[PDB]
Design a protein around this ligand. Sequence first.
Ligand SMILES: Cn1c(C(=O)NC2(c3ccc([C@H](C(=O)O)c4cccnc4)cc3)COC2)cc2c(Cl)c(Cl)ccc21
Ligand SMILES: Cn1c(C(=O)NC2(c3ccc([C@H](C(=O)O)c4cccnc4)cc3)COC2)cc2c(Cl)c(Cl)ccc21
Lengths: 302, 303
Amino acid sequence: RKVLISDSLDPCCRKILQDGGLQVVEKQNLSKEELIAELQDCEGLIVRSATKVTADVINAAEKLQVVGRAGTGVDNVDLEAATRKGILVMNTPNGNSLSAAELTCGMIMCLARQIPQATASMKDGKWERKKFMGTELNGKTLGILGLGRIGREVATRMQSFGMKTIGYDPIISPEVSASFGVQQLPLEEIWPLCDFITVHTPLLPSTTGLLNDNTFAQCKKGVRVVNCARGGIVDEGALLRALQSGQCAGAALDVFTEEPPRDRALVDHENVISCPHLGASTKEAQSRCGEEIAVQFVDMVK
Amino acid sequence: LRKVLISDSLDPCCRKILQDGGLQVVEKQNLSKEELIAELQDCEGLIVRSATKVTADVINAAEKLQVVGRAGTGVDNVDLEAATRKGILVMNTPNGNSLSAAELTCGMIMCLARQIPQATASMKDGKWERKKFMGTELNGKTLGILGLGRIGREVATRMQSFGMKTIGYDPIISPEVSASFGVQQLPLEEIWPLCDFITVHTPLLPSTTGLLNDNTFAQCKKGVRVVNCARGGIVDEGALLRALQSGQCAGAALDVFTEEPPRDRALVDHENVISCPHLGASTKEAQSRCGEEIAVQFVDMVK
Ligand SMILES: Cn1c(C(=O)NC2(c3ccc([C@H](C(=O)O)c4cccnc4)cc3)COC2)cc2c(Cl)c(Cl)ccc21
Ligand SMILES: Cn1c(C(=O)NC2(c3ccc([C@H](C(=O)O)c4cccnc4)cc3)COC2)cc2c(Cl)c(Cl)ccc21
């Protein structure tokens, strides 16, 4: 009967909760001990990416029955510690997909034409039309690794620019991938066909370092890569050397191993487009998330 | 009618198809005015990109110059008055460009929606502000396309796939044909207030110069965003500047300027302006198609 929203979340969350009929507490940038103390009579907790629901927090929260996350994934909640105290963890699987898919297509275009590089150049007062030569997407081959919701939204968009969408996903059948115009192949057959590769998988052991020194070497010379999913699906170290060799012509990253990143080797490279994790950074999405999570809480109050 | 000079960095395949046709060629680069004239003194033809400027003076010092080709669309770097006076032919390559321009345009729109160039310049400076850079979901938003030519319809079919409403205006193409690639046509006065995004794909005309001006900008939605990848001044540079400063315009993307390169560095420098040194036709894919399509035209008239 009492929830706490611990992060900057769309107003409409708190509304639909009270609308449902339970107390709420909008707080922000709270400290670990400040959080626990506030939590000590709250049945629910909703969080964004800021709040980290550690082992310690869950065990200091004697009343905590449920932990909702207004976003995609739960990479900021101890699931081991969660399942131990029989706690529920709630998610917002739909209401974020589109925003992430768009930023991704942004990246691909931005990579093809070096728009961010040209702006930073022009902004410094330089007219370098001698050499900023980019690529026509029409008739090029894009490789999508992770034919989830985001993966298929990215595919249908970049289809319209006349790109070949070949991809790989071990859950989805060739019959269903084909049904949104992505032809499926085994990984070893994908690397050499691609001029562009984007990744849309959760961070798993089966996925970690999916692009590494070894895959990068099987790729077309001057392939270009977009990580808007999770940090490390593309091995950060590995990419760095692929850019330095020219095996990789350029790369776009919305996500890092450390967030925010200490290893500022990549960001700083002249062929790296970067963003401080903006895949869900839209009024449109956070409202749909914030709405879809607050529903799930009220839904189970019957 | 039998010896040509290529004065710019042009795709190798140009010189090939020329000699292939059966006439001498001279691939030179970054030539000086007097260095050019001297080299030209036994060349019937000249092929150029955007770099070389075929001034009044050059044409009149070139007693043998019969023809001037341009590997691109437009010839805003050749004195046409001085050209027609000496009975010289001027050729260009209007086709081999459309797609490259359409893509950069969609680039701009996304880049504007999500501030990708701003985020890179920020990250590149070592900054993580995710609380700051809230952008827009294109899904269900309205794009206004002014100039439903080739480029205009390629831009429309692409941004449709993101789930945008494509309303546009073009006085040449009928509502019946615009509708047939998913652009609903409306009179200009009724377009400004519906748009969250406006791009322009028209030639430079007096009827189109300053198409976006203090007056149109004011009838737009507060925080509209604008893309000029067509010609400098279709969007009044001065007018835009004040629209960004007021917030009537939330941001702008420019591939084209009144002066190229631009002296008035007021716009470029604004924090919500994405800018490019005229890269709409800056793709290996296009310059080859241009370079190929021009060398054809030269050989075609040799028989
Ligand atoms: C488990 N797994 C998946 C996978 O999880 N695929 C499915 C999937 C479902 C939902 C998503 C999410 C989504 O699209 O909503 C998603 C996208 C991007 C980042 N994080 C989450 C992603 C993938 C399709 O049914 C499940 C792809 C995948 C790949 Cl490409 C490899 Cl190589 C290894 C393991 C993999
Ligand atoms: C002459 N004219 C046209 C016009 O020429 N429209 C058509 C057109 C055809 C071809 C183009 C060209 C093209 O799309 O390739 C073009 C685009 C951008 C820059 N330079 C040339 C532009 C427009 C559509 O069928 C012809 C639109 C137009 C408009 Cl919207 C105004 Cl407001 C004033 C005069 C105008």
